[PDB]
Amino acid sequence: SAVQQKLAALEKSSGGRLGVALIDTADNTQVLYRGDERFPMCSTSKVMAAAAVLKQSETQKQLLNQPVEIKPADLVNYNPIAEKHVNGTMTLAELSAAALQYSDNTAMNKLIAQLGGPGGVTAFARAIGDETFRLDRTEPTLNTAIPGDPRDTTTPRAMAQTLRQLTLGHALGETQRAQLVTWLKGNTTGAASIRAGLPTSWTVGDKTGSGDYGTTNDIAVIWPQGRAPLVLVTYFTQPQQNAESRRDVLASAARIIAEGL
Numbered sequence: 657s658a659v660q661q662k663l664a665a666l667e668k669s670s671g672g673r674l675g676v677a678l679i680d681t682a683d684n685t686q687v688l689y690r691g692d693e694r695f696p697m698c699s700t701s702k703v704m705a706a707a708a709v710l711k712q713s714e715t716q717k718q719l720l721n722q723p724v725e726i727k728p729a730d731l732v733n734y735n736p737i738a739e740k741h742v743n744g745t746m747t748l749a750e751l752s753a754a755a756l757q758y759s760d761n762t763a764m765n766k767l768i769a770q771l772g773g774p775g776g777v778t779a780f781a782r783a784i785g786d787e788t789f790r791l792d793r794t795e796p797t798l799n800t801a802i803p804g805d806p807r808d809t810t811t812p813r814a815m816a817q818t819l820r821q822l823t824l825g826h827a828l829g830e831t832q833r834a835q836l837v838t839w840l841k842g843n844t845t846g847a848a849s850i851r852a853g854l855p856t857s858w859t860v861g862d863k864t865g866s867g868d869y870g871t872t873n874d875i876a877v878i879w880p881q882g883r884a885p886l887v888l889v890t891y892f893t894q895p896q897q898n899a900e901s902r903r904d905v906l907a908s909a910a911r912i913i914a915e916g917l
């Protein structure tokens with residue numbers, strides 16, 4: 657199609673490897689570019705950790721209000737929110753919000769621990785039918801994004817389908833679903849990624865991700881005004897270990913997708 661030619665050309669101009677999956681919920685059609693290739697998830701994995709805790713709260717009604725201590729030893733490389741609560745507590749809700757809306761790495765590690773380790777996050781994925789997602793490490797080492805390394809990867813197709821189920825489907829209870837959507841809509845790190853390639857009137861909830869090898873990711877649910885929502889996953893990684901982020905590629909891919917609709 658025209659879109660796949662344009663995405664292929666974008667990829668060629670960028671010098672990296674681009675993965676795209678769009679689901680149009682109107683007719684359930686899919687647009688895929690390298691949709692079945694594995695990409696390092698980096699912080700896009702945090703959506704799975706938050707959703708897993710949300711699933712736990714369906715039975716543990718008060719779980720999200722459970723205070724969790726933030727100790728200096730818990731601090732890793734990027735903790736914009738946890739930093740503000742060292743030697744104090746944050747609720748599991750506040751940690752989920754920090755993981756999603758500020759990409760706090762310490763918060764992500766507390767969610768993993770709540771789930772009993774990375775195997776606990778991966779288990780939730782299998783439970784909702786995602787047999788591709790795999791989380792193997794904690795922050796910050798899950799961001800190494802080494803070419804060919806299957807650890808901490810998923811495919812654009814698998815992630816799009818799963819993000820659809822979590823936000824638009826019923827993988828989560830109604831209250832949990834609404835909370836996840838509210839959290840994603842309030843993401844603060846995505847202004848230069850998918851959002852930048854779309855009309856300003858469209859409502860977007862997304863989770864960005866970055867890591868080594870110039871890995872630059874964004875996954876988003878999109879509510880166009882008057883139109884059925886869309887799910888868009890954009891994964892991008894590069895061959896140089898110290899390559900710079902390329903959020904512009906994510907915006908250009910989003911723009912090319914928006915043109916085809």
Ligand SMILES: *[B@@]1([O])O[C][C]([C][O])O1
Pocket residue numbers: 698699700733734759761796799864865866867
């Ligand atoms: B994710 O990828 O987003 C930011 C942090 C930096 O380690 O992780």
